[PDB]
Amino acid sequence: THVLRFGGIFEYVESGPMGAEELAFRFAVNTINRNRTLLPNTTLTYDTQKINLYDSFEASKKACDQLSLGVAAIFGPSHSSSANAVQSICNALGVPHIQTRWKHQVSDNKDSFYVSLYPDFSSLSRAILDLVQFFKWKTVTVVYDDSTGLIRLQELIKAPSRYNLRLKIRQLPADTKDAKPLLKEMKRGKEFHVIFDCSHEMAAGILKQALAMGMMTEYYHYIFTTLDLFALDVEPYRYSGVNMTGFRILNTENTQVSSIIEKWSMERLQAPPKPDSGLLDGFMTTDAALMYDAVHVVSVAVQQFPQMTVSSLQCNRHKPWRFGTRFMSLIKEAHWEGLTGRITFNKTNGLRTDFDLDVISLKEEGLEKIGTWDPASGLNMTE
Amino acid sequence: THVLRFGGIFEYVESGPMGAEELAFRFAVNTINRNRTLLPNTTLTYDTQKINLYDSFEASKKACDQLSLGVAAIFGPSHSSSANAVQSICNALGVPHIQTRWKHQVSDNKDSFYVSLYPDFSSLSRAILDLVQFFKWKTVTVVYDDSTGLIRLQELIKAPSRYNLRLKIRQLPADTKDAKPLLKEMKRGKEFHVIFDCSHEMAAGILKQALAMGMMTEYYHYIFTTLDLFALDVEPYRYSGVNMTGFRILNTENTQVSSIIEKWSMERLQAPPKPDSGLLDGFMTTDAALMYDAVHVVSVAVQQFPQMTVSSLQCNRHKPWRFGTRFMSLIKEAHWEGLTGRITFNKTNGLRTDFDLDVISLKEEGLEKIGTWDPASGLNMTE
Amino acid sequence: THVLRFGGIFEYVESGPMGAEELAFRFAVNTINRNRTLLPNTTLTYDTQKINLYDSFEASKKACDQLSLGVAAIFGPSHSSSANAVQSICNALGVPHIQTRWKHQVSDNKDSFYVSLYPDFSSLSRAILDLVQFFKWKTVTVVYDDSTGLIRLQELIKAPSRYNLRLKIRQLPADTKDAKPLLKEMKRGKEFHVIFDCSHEMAAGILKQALAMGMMTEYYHYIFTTLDLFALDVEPYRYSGVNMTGFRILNTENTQVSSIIEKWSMERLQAPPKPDSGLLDGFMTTDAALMYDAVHVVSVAVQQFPQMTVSSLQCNRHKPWRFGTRFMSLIKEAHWEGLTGRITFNKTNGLRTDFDLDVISLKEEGLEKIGTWDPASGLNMTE
Amino acid sequence: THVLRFGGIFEYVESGPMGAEELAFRFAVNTINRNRTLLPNTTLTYDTQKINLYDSFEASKKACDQLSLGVAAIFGPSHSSSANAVQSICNALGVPHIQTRWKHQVSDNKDSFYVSLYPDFSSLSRAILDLVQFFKWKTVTVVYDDSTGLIRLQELIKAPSRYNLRLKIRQLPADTKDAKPLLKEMKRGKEFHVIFDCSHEMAAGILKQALAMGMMTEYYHYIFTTLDLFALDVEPYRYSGVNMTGFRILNTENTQVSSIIEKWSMERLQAPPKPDSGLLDGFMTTDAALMYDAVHVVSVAVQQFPQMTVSSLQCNRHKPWRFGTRFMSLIKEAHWEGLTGRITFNKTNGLRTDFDLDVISLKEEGLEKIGTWDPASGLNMTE
Ligand SMILES: *[C@@H]1O[C@H](CO)[C@@H](O)[C@H](O)[C@H]1NC(C)=O
Ligand SMILES: *[C@@H]1O[C@H](CO)[C@@H](O)[C@H](O)[C@H]1NC(C)=O
Ligand SMILES: *[C@@H]1O[C@H](CO)[C@@H](O)[C@H](O)[C@H]1NC(C)=O
Ligand SMILES: *[C@@H]1O[C@H](CO)[C@@H](O)[C@H](O)[C@H]1NC(C)=O
Ligand SMILES: *[C@@H]1O[C@H](CO)[C@@H](O)[C@H](O)[C@H]1NC(C)=O
Ligand SMILES: *[C@@H]1O[C@H](CO)[C@@H](O)[C@H](O)[C@H]1NC(C)=O
Ligand SMILES: *[C@@H]1O[C@H](CO)[C@@H](O)[C@H](O)[C@H]1NC(C)=O
Predict the structure, then answer these.
(1) Which of A283, B51, C95, D213 is the most exposed place for a label (fewest CB within 10 A)?
(2) Cα A224 to chain center, whole Å?
(3) E-assigned strands of chain D?
(4) Residues near D136 by Cβ (< 8 Å), separated by ≥ 6?
């Protein structure tokens, strides 16, 4: 057999229940080592470690401790500041780094030992621009959460340079969950079409706030850049007539993915979120799905090269892994059809710039897919 | 008494001369320890270390090595990826981290042991917006270089939501400094009023291709976010009739600052003499000036804290510096009349938001000051 | 094999290489000597002399010294006063005088033993007038350098009487090359269509001054009366948008002429262009081309007239040359397809009023022929 | 005693005895010697040679023959082509040259042994411009015969660049006195104000065709740049009501000048002017006056240089004249006052630029003096 171990750095929430990404990582390794189809002899081992996600030194220490122990891959923390340091450590010591969240990559950063399964926001911004094109929008407003959102929507912000759009870029107030003043100053300008660049939780929050204000009508259209739009309590919004739209990468249409999501929902019920939050119950966040997909993709990559040996690399001396370049290359060339559709990393840099999105809009019966999106092909509306 | 040591994580050069920031750090250390008035019974010693600035692991190792011996304050690197890791290390070990270049601040980063002397772009973008309001501009063409530039100037991009401006965001090519297609696109669109978010090295090149494209005429107006506009060889452009507004925080109008600049030029024994870069020769860059001011500000803060003994801190066992809190508080509330002017740091965060800018513009006799921008009083552009 | 001597007077260069005209004369003599098709049973030798080009006494003394030896034709100086003196001497002694530069001949002069190869500025100025008609110009500013430029383009100056133009004649500042005040006056007068009458060196200087003055835009159109427009380094102006226009008599399009130009450039190896001069390196000026063509035309003329034993001509005795009349008639009626196209001398006067010009213009890909001009056919502007 | 003789080169004529220039030269030579006040012990002797004025070889040979004999100074030919050769010979041999007619000056010709008594056509053109500004002209038609007229009236032609004058440059037909087509073109062009740069005989002819065309009305103003306008037969136009205007340097309004002119007219009894020519009778043209004044200027210069024993310079080998430099300085520093008013030579040029004109216009009588022009003050229009 094998004692292959994957390193995982996740958020530390002592007061609350276990995190979604870490629980999905455990679920994925359990599925991999239980299903007698992938990695028959190899059995995955847990090396979960918890950090605060906002202290790069703690994450660096945890990653160095993991690499000192037997670890074949690092599943990076979902924060830019921590993940940058973690991938720098991994690149220096040659261990592959896997990221399941978007991190702003510096153009001059010469790091090669990292692959991110979150869809690249260049392609996602192109998809949002294609949505804006399809609706014949002229004057639009963008409402982002963090300054990095401007980076996440640069291919859409740059559109008026070449297009005839009219961006009215706004931002939700920081350190405050109240989006009421922004909506108040937004209604005065008659902003019919709005693009929201916030997380699904705060997207639901601002939707509830707008409904309390009576903002949305039959004449208001919303596009959400979050991929967790399907996991929203849209029942208060069924017949309101709002033209809500968004993207979704979790391939819930496939029966296998649906069964996996249902098993996730029934297994993850120790401490569900509060019902008065605006999110459903039988749902899987796209970050958990991407963690599952990442574990499976790394399992596929290691399957083709079974002669690996797990080392005890130390951070004190830069010792590249004996098999770190080959494993990294196979991970970058690994293809797998999983929860978030087809996974294919770009060869130039390790990112998912080729993915299959589904455009889900608010019909009269919940949120239903109205087409697909493929970077090679473009918008594929069928209805 | 005893000697006092400072951190010196700087750029690494293969075979060329030391960088401007490193030389400014050394020059400042020499200035304080050669001056009787500043720290009479105290000697300043430098511990400069060279890194790639794009290897967060290398920066972390250098910071840990410096803190393993006596270092009282780390003047961290000049890149976001490395500066974040060094800042996290300094916060964990309770040593002040003084940074002289801009870096995106995460909204949920709980870091208290860091001071930035770069004029906060939250205020400098407001200054650019005040200029474009002064010139009665109804359409601008904000042009940036790196995606982080969007994070830099966000208070200027959110202007159409409150003003009647028309922004056309554009990005310079990343493959090479060949902006001729971009300048041709700007010329075709009759976009005369342009804002450049670049560096002086890149701004000089962009001006060169703008002259090559005939874009420097009596109709075009360029506003530069660079604070090194005075360091541009504007002889070919001064007679073109084009007015190129900008800013300058380096208080070159003062006589002590001018003398220090002259000494800097005299001691600069290795400068690029190539007559094709578009930059002048006898001028101190704003980054070197900010590093000089950083050393001086930390010197002033040290003078207010006698009996401060520097200990040896190990990254393996997280043990905060005993004198870190008092020294950090003294650095935060430190006022100094340095080369960049008044140096007062904000109290809530560590950023420098209150600074005295000097708006400059290009006339037939060169680049000359045409006013002064102050956050408290706005633009005092009355000549 | 009858021997033959060709007299020539050229500029005296105190140091370095000799003038381009003397090099062209020597190269043409060598080419005729090595070619057996031209002048088969004969030979050509040269008797080059050097003068200041401004001392008519020196030119007269050199011409008399050459006439003391047996010379068949004198290739006189390229300056008005010295050329006039040598032409009078040759007309008195009966030997032909071959001149390749424009020189004002007074109306009542009766000299017959002289022929000119420079395109007469009564047909060429008519070509600039035809270009002005084609461009539909209504306001034109003619800018010349020397006082003899008005007498040169007199047919262009006398245009408003017979057409509808707004000539605004201006003169380049004498004793200096800095035309910044003149260009500022032209810009203040909104004079966008300018016809420059200056040498290619001064043309390049004025182009540099206008680029520094912001006059290199799509608004400004410059017509150059110089025939060496191909020798200007238009790298900084091709992308500006100026539609620079001019002529080129040098038949560079031909393969034989291109081969001869390449041979001349390879043989030159002398007088490298100044880095900031603004001219090109491997291009031959039209003056050297006309000297080469003059030697070839006189070789053709003497080919048709064998047994011409050149005798000694005494200036003091003043005995006309025995073969002078018929040899000069043959030169005047000679025909030759040389470097500067077809070389046909007028019958009434010896000037060259019949020539083919290649109207070239500046595009984004450099200068390239855009039409053809012929005194009989007129403009044939077809790109 | 100390005998000094002057050499002169004039026109060769066969019908008339000798030209007016030589008449004035002989009159001056045999007047100064008789007047014992000027040159008490130095008899002036004329050495007259006659040339074709269009053969630079003949003029050069005659000048060399004269310089072989003892000659203090050469009174060069009244042409513009042989005068250049003679002045070059004089400069090379270091002998003063005196020119009484205007010839085109090469910009870079380094000659310092010539003085031109003809009022230079750079102050005369400014006088014409001041005269047309005084009359408040807007449409001006410049007419000339010799192309060199463009070089002469270049300051007048360069007027539209500064002011609003609309110059319409025209040229009289060459080799033909039937100027009717030009006058018809004027009639069809409705050109009312004309500036004639033609000789007095040609001016009278042009006035004759104008009267034949009925163009001597009250709406037609004629400015004549010629200084011999007072010599015209204006009786047939005296009551025509025209506004004919010109200039007059020949100070006829002086007792001594009037007596000298009367004596010259009395001596001129060999060839009366043609009765049917439009010219007066018994008058002295400005060229003869300039020659007479030139001889007196040289006499004043030699007054202070009484030791200049003439030499026997040969043209075969150039030998500078020992007395040439100081005699030339005295020539250029002689403020003699004669028929053409105050005679002062420009130190940096040698030409006469500071002269005193007297504006004359047609009235009920013949050409009364209506003003005075000086280069320093300006147009002193008193009338
Ligand atoms: C909103 O607009 C979309 C765009 O076609 C449409 O499919 C949807 O039915 C609309 N919803 C309404 C009108 O409630
Ligand atoms: C959409 O996708 C299908 C298959 O996924 C493909 O055959 C088709 O060409 C695409 N485009 C359109 C417009 O249907
Ligand atoms: C001069 O600067 C002003 C800014 O007040 C600008 O509006 C104008 O276009 C400039 N003039 C030029 C570029 O000729
Ligand atoms: C602007 O500056 C001038 C000169 O420094 C000063 O007199 C004036 O009071 C200032 N105005 C302000 C600060 O509002
Ligand atoms: C050619 O010149 C005209 C001006 O007559 C100008 O309008 C046009 O743009 C020019 N063509 C170019 C620059 O390609
Ligand atoms: C212009 O030149 C072309 C040759 O390219 C010729 O065919 C055409 O006839 C010419 N047009 C004239 C002479 O009008
Ligand atoms: C002009 O002529 C008058 C004639 O009386 C004279 O008094 C005056 O001094 C002259 N000059 C000026 C500048 O008026």
Answers:
(1) D213
(2) 14
(3) 4-11, 44-51, 74-75, 97-99, 114-119, 139-144, 166-167, 170-171, 193-197, 221-224, 245-246, 337-338, 341-342, 351-352, 360-361, 368-369, 373-374, 378-379
(4) none
User: Strands D337-338, D245-246: parallel, antiparallel or unpaired by DSSP?
Assistant: unpaired
Identify the CATH assignment for B121-226+229-252+357-379 out of 1.10.8.60, 3.40.190.10, 3.40.50.2300, 3.40.50.300.
3.40.50.2300
Range C5-119+285-344 classified under CATH 1.10.10.10: no
In angstroms, rounded to a whole number, what is the distance separating the alpha carbons of residues D258 and A263? 132
Site of tokens 């455990």? A26
Q: What is the resolution of this structure in A?
A: 3.1
Separation between Cα atoms, residue C43 and residue C27, nearest integer Å: 14
B12 lines ligand 3 (CB under 6 A): no
The burial class, CB within 10 Å (0-12 / 13-18 / 19+), for B383 is exposed
> Which structure tokens are listed for A136?
């014949």
Question: Residue C352 and residue C374: Cα distance in Å, rounded?
Answer: 13
* Residue with CA nearest ligand 2 atom 4: A380
Per DSSP, C19 falls in state P
| Strand, coil or helix: B245 | strand
- The SS3 of residue B101 is coil
Q: Can you read off the two tokens belonging to residue D250?
A: 């020949």
Establish if C212 touches chain B: CB-CB under 8 angstroms.
yes
Query: Which residue precedes each gap in chain B (C to N above 2.5 Å)?
Result: none
Torsion angle of the four alpha carbons C220, C223, C228, C233, in this order, in degrees rounded to the nearest 10? 10
Residues 74-103 of D with CB under 8 A from C: 80-81, 84-85, 88-89, 91-93
Rounded Cα–Cα distance for residues A202 and A222 (Å): 14
- Containing B343, the helix (H) or strand (E) segment is strand B341-344
- Enclosing H/E stretch for C325: helix C324-332
* Helices A200-213/A180-187 angle, 10° precision: 60
Radius of gyration from C-alpha coordinates of chain C:
21
Q: Residue with structure tokens 């081969």? A: C259
Contact of C32 with C299, CB cutoff 8 Å:
yes
What 3-state class would DSSP assign to D289? helix
d(CA C131, CA C136): 9
First to last CA, chain B: 50
Residues 6+ apart with CB under 8 A from B224: B195, B196, B198, B203, B244, B245, B246, B247
2.60.40.10, 3.40.50.1820, 3.30.360.10, 3.40.50.2300: which CATH number matches A122-249+357-381?
A: 3.40.50.2300
Task: In whole angstroms, give the CA distance from residue C331 to residue C302.
Answer: 8
The amino acid occupying position C192 is F
Taking the C-alpha atoms of residue B9 and residue B19, their distance in angstroms, rounded to an integer, is 12
Structure-determination technique: cryo-EM
Contact D359, D245 (CB under 8 A): yes
Residue closest to C335 by CA, chosen among C355, C321, C308: C355
Residue C51's nearest CA partner among C93, C80, C8 is C8
Residue D344 is given by DSSP the state B
Nearest chain C residue to D172 by CA: give it. C158
Superfamily designation of domain A5-120+257-272+285-352: Response regulator (3.40.50.2300)
Tokens of D110: 């380094």
Look up tokens 């500067």; give the residue.
C340
Separation in Å, CA B114 to CA A83, B85, B118, B331: 20, 12, 12, 9
B380–chain A Cβ distance below 8 A for any pair: no
d(CA D271, CA B301): 110
Block residue for tokens 């978010």: B197
Cα separation, B60 vs A278, whole angstroms: 42
Residue nearest to atom 1 of ligand 6 (CA): C380
CA of A226 to the centre of ligand 2 (A): 24
Phi/psi of residue D283, each to 5°?
A: -125, 165
